[PDB]
RNA sequence: CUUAGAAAGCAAACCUAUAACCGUUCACCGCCGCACAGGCGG
């Protein structure tokens, strides 16, 4: 018995981890179709009509309403109608492939660098207060002036403009400076900080010290120190934190959201494209494969079995179904 | 027992336009000189490949076609179905990102929850689209290599090119699946849970369905009935789900709503446009599917019978 | 340099010779000439034909001179032009560069065969081989 | 969430006259009389043209090139690209976009370029979609022919070239202005449409200059550009919005008229040929399917007979 | 700001002659038959070859001299109209005619547009012609005539210039324009930043801006060369008989081609200044 | 119910300026004269 399925505009790609032949988890399947995911190992998946894809279409055509992995497990019924015939079905696929790029949708993450929504909050009290200048001015000192400030020095005339961008830029620069060796004149400002801030350690794997980890801890100093001169509540979160700036570093998106009306910038999706450098061919690109054509399924069974199948179809009254993904596949001819 | 009535609403869409509205992107091609050109953008071409033949084994490099070597009868222009669907539901393109379990109530009572289908982030709730669309495939093939440039610049990075088109005439086929349209699974049994429910919520949800579907055509009398165990009509299966089934008038409203959106569809994109010119409908009550495709004479334009009822 | 530009130069070189020399018994002939300038000059002096100059009594400058002398009507200009452009000289010519008047002008040459000299080694009577 | 009514687009039909080719395609490899390929024959822009005959021979893989004189100007006519038409419609501000940065982008927005023409800023990726759409300017007369040229006195190799040139030309074309794209100006990166990035107070200021520029187009009118922090598109289910500026109907009417007026006076001098727009017919389309003027010319309404559609509301 | 005044100087040309002045080249019609320049002509019929897409040829005797008439190309006219580095500029060739110099990004666009000189009397039957009568139109662009760009900013540099050299070139320009007509007071002024009207950033380029009387002499010299145009060629000739001029102060050009009643044969207003100095 | 289900490659850009298909780039500038008479100089 031959069943000829004609289809058109079917997707031949897959973006989800795990498998579709087992119950779908609580939070769902992990999405591996974003820009970063596709570059890595084997996240880029190409799909062909396998056996499972032909069985789910045979069950679908007889009206079944339980995931194909459930029909195979005889989950909510007595027997699996095709358990005997699964070793008796063949199929020939006759597609015409097409390579196009499709903008797929991503349903979780958000962007940090160069990413914010709404208006920039340049009027926030932290920038427009009397304490504001000699508080952010700590981030403008060079590394020699800072180390002397950390030793109770009350002088911070370093004046810069107060606004989210310039601050986050100055923190970008200070994060791009090289590391420093543990000198002896440095070791004392490490005693001062680690007396102020015991629970954290300013060190890398091999005794390195990042400059930004010192500018930030110095800014927490300025916060605690100034608390005698002015009222800092507008400069902290509740519970005495600094928004987007930890004593070890700074989180960009957290800082930018706090100072921008409107939520964080969401990544709505990305084009299904993967550019690898493959020697001999230069740079080869990989897109989404779309297929169109017909798929001939043949089951070697008694003619009576064939007529039983053909009327089980008519009994279910199914019509026009997708094929693997987002297609238009109907049944065009049935041969007993 | 045999399932009777209208199984699916088939249709054949003829659209008109000018220029390409859906682009594929820059492709590696070679020019009339033999040197490889970097940035020549190609539209979406059915079955097109930019490769000719191989080269020596110790390189593996594949020979690239010339940017002017294209047969729009063999590889015609088309608009991706993914682009068509985006513009049929363009107004709710970003809504699903804001869909959650709490507000999922509102996602369902809408054209997106009923026709588009949807997915819920970080959830296992789904709804498969009852609308099936092919690609819009051009019939005129008025394409040609077009060279572009920038005024006030002569360097190599100033000039780009594209394969552009003039007048276009697309043709497409589609189907509205009644089995997918009239039933709404609320049960995790078959992983089709349109949404997670507490007992008693079945009746309230049907009312909101009823309200929204009524708002599509006040002249009609829709009905959304919840039940704890809906089973499929013609199967050999005795397992069902708790869900919602629309009566014949509710189905008559949704079908008429989609057909209208398809009839008024228009795409303005990439400095090109496309509008739906003519649409031919077939209320298929026969056993053969896509009857409109193989045989256009056995078509029935107006609804001549009740829609098939797929669930008890 | 081509067959067209070298002749024009040597002809002016030959023209200035017998001007400062001021001779009237030296001539010119063109053996390998045919429907165009010859490639081999043959100076005669110190095969029974004669070589002569050829120029038109009409010019652009002469019409502009008439319009300045007040002897030309607006319809006279139109009839003057039809006659000037109407005449066509199949005769071999040279485009002689110049510096005294600063103009590039064309000079024509005619012949008569089977049977004293101006500045250009041509005459209306003097015979030459 | 109510249906949107009013004028949705302003379509039109353009009739132009000229002489010679104004917009060229470039050199194409062709074969000449004698069947031996010519390297430099420049071709104009011919819609639907291909220089291949679709013939191959005996495992060579070589593709036959058409004869330089084998062209049917009825089946693949001469046309003027939209890229060339747009460049000359805004030729006064042809180079101003290259001098745009995060500091002066305010001036780029308030201008015929920022409102009708599009723009993309490469440094900051700020952009705006052009609400203007132009078909090809397709020639109707097809007075084309193979023309051979030469160089004075060179008389060497490569001194002679050739082109496919045209005499009297007459172009016909259609276009449309999108009210939705034309009436709203996004100032938010939320939907990747940020025309520009603003500080808190900057929103209202930008609209003031927007309004000021639009006012100078027609002093008789009362245009308005109103900033709001949450402009919502009609039809969403969760009513999520963005920062932007929305133009009232009088502002839309001015921009609509300035463009048509500019289109009516369009003239192109280039490549030693010219073209000027002779007649223009307009249709204020209130139906959904655009280009109504194209399929049925009896239904068009030459005047503004209703208010313009409002696709966005504040919240 | 808004631009007023004369924007262009259009005109209609009427010429007389005889025979073919401008030929096309070799042609295969089988035999080599050199055809003149016919507008709309094609030497290919509607027949195709086998195993190749090439088409059969026409016969040398199938031409409709009313359907594909005779014309003298713009490239031919521009040759016999001008008939003739720091010196290229400040001449008829460098100001009215254009130029590009290879091995150098220098160029100037010719402000002179010329249509085909199209035959009206179809007297044809090599294939030779009898009495010919030509018609044509043409235009002079004031924008492309009045400004001389010496800046590589927009790839418009007519000449690579060093400091100080600006005012010398301008003075020589003004001298050549003065020689065309000593009764006039032409001006060729140089500036380091000439801004065109209509921009938004007022980005300028260094160049030379001719004044009203300088455009006047150059326009008069050009029209003078066109009325006295006359081509002599082995197979025919032509000469310009009459010529009508319109000083177009409207926006759309070729006003003389769509309504001959609205033209002004004289200069009735000042020329348009497309550029100003900032 | 199959590759679980939903999924814009999007937004912006002059192929641009110069060139007899040809007899050798070139019928040139001026002078005598009423001359659309005939000639002269380079």
């Amino acid at each position: 018995m031959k069943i000829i399925i004609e289809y058109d505009s079917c997707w031949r790609n897959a973006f989800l981890g795990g498998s579709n032949n087992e119950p779908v988890p609580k939070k769902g399947r992990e999405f591996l179709g974003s820009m970063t995911s596709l570059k890595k190992e084997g996240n880029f998946k190409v799909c062909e009509n396998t056996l499972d894809t032909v069985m789910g279409v045979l069950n679908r055509l007889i009206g079944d309403q339980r995931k194909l992995y459930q029909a195979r497990s005889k989950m909510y019924e007595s027997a699996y109608y095709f358990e005997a015939l699964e070793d008796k079905v063949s199929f020939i696929d006759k597609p015409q492939l097409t390579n196009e790029i499709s903008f797929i949708r991503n349903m979780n993450g958000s962007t940090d660098q160069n990413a914010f929504t709404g208006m920039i909050k340049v009027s926030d009290p932290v920038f427009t207060s009397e304490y504001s200048q000699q508080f952010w001015g700590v981030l403008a000192l060079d590394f020699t002036q800072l180390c002397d400030f950390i030793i109770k020095q009350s002088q911070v005339v370093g004046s810069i403009e107060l606004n989210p961008l310039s601050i986050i830029n100055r923190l970008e620069s200070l994060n791009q400076e090289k590391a420093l060796e543990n000198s002896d004149d440095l070791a004392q400002v490490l005693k001062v900080l680690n007396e102020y801030f015991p629970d954290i350690e300013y060190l890398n794997n091999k005794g390195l010290i990042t400059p930004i980890s010192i500018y930030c801890s110095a800014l927490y100093l300025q916060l605690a120190r100034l608390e005698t001169s002015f009222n800092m509540t507008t400069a902290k979160t509740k519970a005495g934190g600094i928004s987007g700036i930890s004593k070890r570093g700074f989180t960009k998106k957290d800082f930018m959201d706090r100072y921008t009306t409107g939520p964080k910038k969401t990544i709505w999706g990305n084009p299904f494209i993967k550019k690898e450098k493959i020697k001999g061919q230069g740079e080869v690109t990989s897109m989404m494969t779309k297929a169109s054509g017909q798929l001939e399924i043949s089951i070697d069974v008694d003619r009576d079995k064939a007529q039983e199948i053909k009327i089980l179809i008519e009994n279910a009254g199914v019509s026009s179904f997708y094929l693997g993904k987002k297609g238009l596949a109907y049944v065009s001819n049935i041969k007993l | 027992q045999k399932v009777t009535g209208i199984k699916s609403v088939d249709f054949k869409i003829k659209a008109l336009g000018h220029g390409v509205v859906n682009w594929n992107g820059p492709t590696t091609l070679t020019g009339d000189d033999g040197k490889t050109v970097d940035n020549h953008t190609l539209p979406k071409l059915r079955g097109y490949t930019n490769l000719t033949g191989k080269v020596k084994d110790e390189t593996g490099y594949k020979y690239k076609k010339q940017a002017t070597d294209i047969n729009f009868k063999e590889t015609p222009l088309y608009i991706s179905q993914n682009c068509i669907r985006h513009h049929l539901f363009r107004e709710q393109a970003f809504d699903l990102h804001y869909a959650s379990d709490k507000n999922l109530k509102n996602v369902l009572a809408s054209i997106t929850g009923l026709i588009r289908g949807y997915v819920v982030p970080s959830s296992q709730c789904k709804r498969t689209s009852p609308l099936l669309l092919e690609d819009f495939v051009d019939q005129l093939g008025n394409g040609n290599f077009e060279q572009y440039g920038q005024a006030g610049a002569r360097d190599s990075t100033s000039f780009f090119s594209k394969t552009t088109f003039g007048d276009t005439e697309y043709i497409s086929y589609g189907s509205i699946s009644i089995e997918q349209l009239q039933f709404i699974s609320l049960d995790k049994k078959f992983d089709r849970a349109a949404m997670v429910i507490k007992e008693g919520e079945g009746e309230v949800i049907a009312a909101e369905l009823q309200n929204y579907i009524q708002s599509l055509n006040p002249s009609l009398n829709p009905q959304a009935i919840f039940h704890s165990n809906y089973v499929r009509r013609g199967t050999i299966f005795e397992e069902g789900e708790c869900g919602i089934l629309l009566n014949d008038d509710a189905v008559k409203a949704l079908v008429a709503e989609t057909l209208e959106r398809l009839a008024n569809l228009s795409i303005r994109q990439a400095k090109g446009y496309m509008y739906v010119d003519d649409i031919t409908v077939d209320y298929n009550d026969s056993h053969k599917m896509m009857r409109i495709k193989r045989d256009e004479s056995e078509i029935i334009n107006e609804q001549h019978a009740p829609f098939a009822q797929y669930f008890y | 340099m081509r067959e067209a530009e070298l002749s024009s130069k040597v002809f002016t070189k030959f023209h200035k010779a017998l001007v400062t020399l001021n001779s009237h018994k030296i001539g010119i002939s063109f053996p390998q000439m045919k429907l165009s300038l010859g490639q081999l000059f043959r100076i005669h002096g110190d095969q029974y034909r004669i070589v002569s100059v050829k120029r038109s009594n009409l010019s652009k400058a002469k019409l502009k001179r008439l319009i300045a002398r007040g002897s030309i009507d607006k319809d006279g200009e139109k009839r003057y032009k039809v006659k000037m452009l109407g005449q066509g000289f199949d005769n071999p010519y040279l485009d002689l560069f110049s510096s005294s008047t600063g103009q590039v002008y064309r000079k024509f040459f005619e012949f008569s065969d089977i049977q004293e000299f101006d500045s250009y080694g041509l005459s209306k009577t003097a015979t030459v081989p």
Side-chain angles (χ1 to χ4, degrees), chain A, chain B, chain C:
Chain A
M1 177 195 62
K2 292 175 64 71
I3 306 178
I4 290 73
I5 295 179
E6 283 183 340
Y7 58 97
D8 186 300
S9 309
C10 301
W11 289 17
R12 298 299 189 92
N13 291 96
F15 332 108
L16 292 183
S19 184
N20 176 75
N21 304 320
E22 55 199 39
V24 292
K26 167 61 61 181
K27 300 302 177 183
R29 305 251 293 277
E30 183 188 7
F31 167 67
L32 311 168
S34 65
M35 208 59 96
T36 57
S37 297
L38 297 174
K39 300 181 177 182
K40 289 143 56 183
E41 178 184 14
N43 295 331
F44 191 92
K45 293 191 175 71
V46 183
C47 298
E48 166 63 32
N49 292 337
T50 67
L51 190 59
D52 304 334
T53 312
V54 178
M55 293 315 307
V57 167
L58 264 301
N59 294 115
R60 173 78 182 97
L61 282 166
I62 61 178
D64 186 333
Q65 312 284 299
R66 336 157 279 160
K67 289 279 289 296
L68 170 125
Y69 86 94
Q70 303 174 344
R72 290 174 181 256
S73 292
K74 302 178 289 295
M75 192 144 296
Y76 286 92
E77 297 293 356
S78 55
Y80 169 51
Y81 182 94
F82 289 107
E83 185 174 11
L85 304 179
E86 211 159 75
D87 298 327
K88 211 63 179 180
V89 52
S90 59
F91 60 93
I92 293 183
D93 195 5
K94 300 183 174 183
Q96 187 213 37
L97 308 94
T98 302
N99 290 282
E100 68 176 21
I101 71 182
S102 303
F103 193 87
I104 63 172
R105 287 283 173 155
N106 180 17
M107 295 287 174
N108 16 274
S110 70
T111 306
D112 53 320
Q113 180 180 73
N114 320 338
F116 66 88
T117 67
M119 294 157 289
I120 293 177
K121 288 191 60 62
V122 284
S123 60
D124 186 293
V126 69
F127 304 119
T128 70
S129 294
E130 295 193 6
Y131 73 87
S132 184
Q133 188 57 79
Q134 78 179 217
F135 167 78
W136 293 110
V138 169
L139 299 190
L141 310 176
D142 57 17
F143 192 78
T144 170
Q145 289 176 303
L146 184 71
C147 289
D148 261 51
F149 160 86
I150 294 192
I151 312 302
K152 300 292 184 292
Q153 208 61 19
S154 160
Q155 293 71 2
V156 176
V157 82
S159 182
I160 68 179
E161 280 200 296
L162 307 317
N163 41 83
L165 289 189
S166 66
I167 296 298
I168 194 59
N169 285 337
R170 184 52 181 163
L171 290 168
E172 282 283 20
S173 169
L174 291 177
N175 192 23
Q176 200 171 136
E177 303 271 19
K178 350 283 185 299
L180 307 184
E181 292 158 271
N182 199 324
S183 185
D184 74 280
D185 56 329
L186 254 64
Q188 44 182 328
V189 309
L190 262 286
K191 300 180 180 61
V192 166
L193 291 187
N194 275 329
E195 273 196 339
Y196 269 85
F197 313 136
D199 44 284
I200 74 180
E201 177 221 35
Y202 313 92
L203 206 73
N204 223 321
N205 187 310
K206 302 286 184 174
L208 284 187
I209 291 77
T210 320
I212 186 59
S213 65
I214 277 57
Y215 271 95
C216 293
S217 285
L219 191 54
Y220 272 79
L221 257 281
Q222 189 65 310
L223 171 58
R225 289 182 178 177
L226 287 178
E227 217 136 332
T228 69
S229 297
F230 314 103
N231 179 15
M232 295 304 97
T233 41
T234 57
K236 345 171 178 178
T237 71
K238 286 178 73 71
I242 299 186
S243 297
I245 295 181
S246 65
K247 294 190 290 293
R248 192 184 307 262
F250 68 101
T251 306
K252 184 175 180 178
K253 40 166 49 185
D254 285 341
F255 182 90
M256 283 307 303
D257 184 11
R258 163 65 167 88
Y259 298 98
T260 62
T261 73
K264 300 188 175 184
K265 169 59 171 56
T266 304
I267 294 182
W268 308 105
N270 57 269
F272 195 63
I273 193 69
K274 176 190 179 186
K275 285 186 178 179
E276 293 187 322
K277 204 67 82 73
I278 299 188
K279 319 309 169 298
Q281 289 99 342
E283 173 178 88
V284 71
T285 66
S286 301
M287 300 172 172
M288 174 174 308
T289 313
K290 175 175 289 184
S292 301
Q294 63 184 78
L295 163 77
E296 315 172 9
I297 77 94
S298 293
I299 311 184
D300 190 24
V301 292
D302 201 289
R303 195 166 224 272
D304 302 328
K305 257 289 190 179
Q307 188 60 232
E308 166 171 297
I309 305 293
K310 179 184 177 182
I311 60 175
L312 255 58
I313 302 304
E314 297 178 326
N315 261 16
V318 190
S319 73
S320 70
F321 48 102
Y322 76 86
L323 182 36
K325 185 163 296 183
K326 307 201 170 59
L328 176 76
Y330 67 95
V331 183
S332 175
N333 178 24
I334 300 185
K335 288 292 187 174
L336 295 174
Chain B
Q1 60 284 91
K2 285 290 185 60
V3 188
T4 56
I6 279 67
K7 261 47 192 170
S8 56
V9 180
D10 310 351
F11 47 84
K12 184 195 66 178
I13 307 179
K14 175 191 172 183
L16 304 166
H18 185 81
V20 172
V21 304
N22 188 219
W23 284 101
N24 220 8
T27 311
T28 302
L29 292 159
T30 69
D32 293 331
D33 55 334
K35 284 172 50 61
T36 174
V37 52
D38 271 332
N39 54 346
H40 172 82
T41 306
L42 282 174
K44 304 212 168 184
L45 296 179
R46 176 71 86 194
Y48 176 85
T49 179
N50 70 321
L51 277 41
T52 61
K54 313 295 187 58
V55 194
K56 53 184 296 184
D57 194 327
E58 286 204 356
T59 184
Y61 178 85
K62 290 192 173 63
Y63 270 139
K64 303 292 185 299
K65 284 185 175 182
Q66 292 189 109
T68 176
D69 178 17
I70 306 173
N71 193 326
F72 304 107
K73 298 185 304 173
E74 296 182 342
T75 58
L77 174 73
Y78 76 87
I79 305 177
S80 181
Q81 51 87 347
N82 206 33
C83 177
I84 300 296
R85 306 179 59 91
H86 171 87
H87 288 260
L88 258 180
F89 314 96
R90 196 170 68 85
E91 303 141 46
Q92 294 159 352
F94 298 99
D95 282 318
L96 294 185
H97 298 255
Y98 299 103
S100 60
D101 50 338
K102 43 154 295 185
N103 57 34
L104 194 46
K105 198 181 192 182
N106 305 276
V107 175
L108 190 54
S110 59
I111 196 66
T112 171
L114 291 172
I115 306 311
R116 182 195 200 186
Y118 60 86
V119 308
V120 185
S122 310
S123 158
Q124 54 180 147
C125 299
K126 94 169 77 175
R127 177 143 166 81
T128 301
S129 170
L131 179 60
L132 304 180
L133 279 172
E134 301 178 343
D135 299 328
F136 284 65
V137 186
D138 173 44
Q139 307 288 303
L140 306 179
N142 311 295
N144 57 267
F145 174 94
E146 174 162 340
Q147 179 85 238
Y148 292 99
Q150 302 182 33
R154 303 282 308 286
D155 41 318
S156 301
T157 70
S158 303
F159 291 171
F160 60 105
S161 58
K162 300 183 178 183
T163 296
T164 66
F165 278 72
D167 298 338
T168 53
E169 174 176 341
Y170 313 86
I171 290 180
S172 179
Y173 292 81
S175 174
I176 311 181
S177 175
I178 278 64
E179 174 178 2
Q180 302 287 20
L181 179 61
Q182 72 179 193
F183 178 62
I184 304 173
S185 179
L186 291 67
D187 207 328
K188 314 165 58 63
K189 180 178 302 181
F190 304 138
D191 303 302
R192 301 162 64 181
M195 55 179 57
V196 52
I197 301 303
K198 302 175 300 181
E199 289 203 23
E201 291 187 338
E203 286 197 354
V204 50
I205 295 172
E208 297 196 338
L209 264 297
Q210 180 78 325
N211 277 261
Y212 178 78
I213 306 175
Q214 181 71 77
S215 62
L216 298 183
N217 190 345
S219 313
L220 298 174
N221 301 320
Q223 289 272 68
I225 306 81
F226 171 88
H227 194 258
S228 58
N229 199 268
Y230 266 108
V231 189
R232 206 195 182 282
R233 257 275 193 91
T235 85
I236 74 186
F237 304 90
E238 310 154 15
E239 202 60 23
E241 296 170 307
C242 60
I244 298 175
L245 180 134
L246 303 318
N247 67 316
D248 180 287
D249 271 26
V251 168
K252 185 176 184 180
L254 295 179
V255 162
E257 171 66 13
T258 61
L259 290 177
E260 192 185 63
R261 293 170 162 269
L262 283 169
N264 300 126
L265 179 66
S266 57
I267 304 185
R268 154 135 47 180
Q269 189 165 272
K271 311 215 192 62
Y273 73 93
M274 165 277 213
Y275 60 86
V276 171
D277 180 71
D278 182 24
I279 175 175
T280 302
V281 181
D282 171 52
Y283 291 81
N284 205 343
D285 58 336
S286 63
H287 291 90
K288 62 184 65 176
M289 318 178 191
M290 286 311 101
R291 183 173 58 191
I292 190 178
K293 201 159 186 175
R294 77 174 73 185
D295 198 351
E296 202 170 48
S297 301
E298 301 180 353
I299 301 309
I300 305 176
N301 303 276
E302 290 186 345
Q303 181 181 0
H304 61 290
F307 296 111
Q309 297 293 316
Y310 281 71
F311 299 87
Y312 279 147
Chain C
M1 205 162 301
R2 300 165 53 183
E3 180 191 33
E5 186 184 359
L6 92 168
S7 174
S8 172
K9 236 72 71 171
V10 306
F11 200 81
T12 305
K13 278 297 179 59
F14 170 74
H15 160 54
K16 292 298 299 181
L18 61 148
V19 164
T20 60
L21 210 174
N22 207 93
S23 174
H24 56 276
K25 186 183 285 187
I26 194 64
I28 296 287
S29 88
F30 308 130
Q32 279 118 43
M33 166 273 308
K34 196 54 56 191
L35 278 75
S36 178
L37 79 179
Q39 52 186 352
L40 190 284
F41 288 2
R42 208 204 287 184
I43 299 183
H44 289 94
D46 194 293
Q47 303 294 272
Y48 214 41
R49 65 177 81 113
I50 168 179
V51 55
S52 180
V53 192
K54 183 174 174 61
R55 84 180 298 182
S56 179
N57 280 199
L58 302 178
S59 166
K60 277 185 187 169
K62 285 193 64 176
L63 173 58
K64 179 178 170 237
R65 169 182 167 97
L66 285 188
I67 309 175
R69 294 170 56 81
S71 309
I72 269 298
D73 191 0
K74 193 224 166 183
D75 220 301
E77 303 182 17
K78 301 181 178 181
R79 292 182 282 108
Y80 185 105
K81 289 189 167 186
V82 170
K83 183 174 302 179
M84 166 181 47
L85 302 174
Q87 67 179 175
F89 298 170
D90 62 75
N91 305 43
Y93 68 89
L94 257 295
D95 295 350
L96 298 177
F97 304 89
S98 166
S99 46
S100 353
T101 176
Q103 306 294 338
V104 189
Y105 69 97
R106 183 172 303 187
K107 179 176 286 293
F108 303 94
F109 316 83
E110 81 157 3
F111 315 90
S112 47
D113 40 87
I114 177 175
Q115 284 178 53
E116 198 75 355
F117 286 88
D118 76 327
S119 301
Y120 305 88
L122 262 48
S123 182
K124 191 183 295 292
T125 53
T127 313
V128 285

